[PDB]
Design a protein around this ligand. Structure first.
Ligand code: MNH
Ligand code: NA
Ligand SMILES: [Zn+2]
Length: 187
């Protein structure tokens, strides 16, 4: 897991809970004097342990916390890789490009990143079928990111998530409904 993901998490924990709390999380779930360098790889278990700790402090379901992180993470990625997100003029284009443009670039920007496998298909009625697959099983982080992407383009979405790696499938299907954006009027 790249340091940048940890850095965005810090911004989140520091904003909601305070810097004193982040240093608790970090002292407890990471080796002495850890510094997350944005471009370096670190053990994904350090992230899961920090996030699991937060979920428990807040008495929240772990996937609700991961989803909320994903939503904060989109903005934090977009502002650190503005050149990548400015390639897209609307939500639907960005979703259709997560795999072949965005995470494709992430392979040129970062040494050997650990990325999911994603394929989007455009459906009738302004829906997208986004198939997700990853051994890390972070489909709820992906829901958050989609909600973040929506906020970014002043779009409104809903997501159905009824095939899931957590309920035994080898992938997830995120059926995205685009309810509104600046180019949707009556329908
Ligand atoms: C909305 C769109 C969107 C979705 C659904 C999305 C999905 C994911 C998910 C889920 C993961 C966690 C790992 C896994 O195996 O599941 C992940 C990781 C990652 N993604 Mn993104 N991603 C973006 C946008 C998205 N990404 C943008 C914008 C950037 C920045 C250019 C970016 C760059 C990354 C980086 C960097 C990683 C981390 C890889 C690693 O830690 O090694 N990407
Ligand atoms: Na509109
Ligand atoms: Zn899932």
């Amino acid at each position: 897991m790249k340091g940048i993901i940890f850095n965005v998490l810090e911004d989140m924990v520091v904003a909601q809970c305070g810097m004193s709390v982040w240093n608790e999380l970090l002292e407890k779930h990471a080796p002495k004097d850890r510094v997350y360098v944005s471009a370096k790889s670190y053990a994904e278990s350090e992230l899961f342990s920090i996030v699991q700790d937060v979920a428990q402090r807040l008495n929240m379901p772990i996937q609700d916390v991961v989803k909320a992180f994903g939503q904060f993470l989109f903005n934090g990625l977009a502002s650190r890789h503005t050149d990548v997100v400015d390639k897209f003029d609307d939500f639907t284009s960005l979703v259709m490009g997560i795999h072949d443009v965005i995470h494709l670039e992430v392979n040129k920007l970062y040494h050997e990143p650990s990325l999911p496998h994603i394929n989007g298909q455009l459906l009738p009625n302004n829906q997208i079928a986004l198939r997700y697959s990853s051994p890390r099983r972070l489909c709820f982080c992906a829901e958050g990111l989609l909600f973040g992407a929506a906020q970014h383009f002043a779009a409104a979405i809903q997501i159905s998530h009824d095939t899931c790696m957590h309920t035994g499938a080898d992938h997830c299907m995120l059926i995205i409904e685009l309810q509104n954006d600046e180019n949707l009027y009556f329908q």
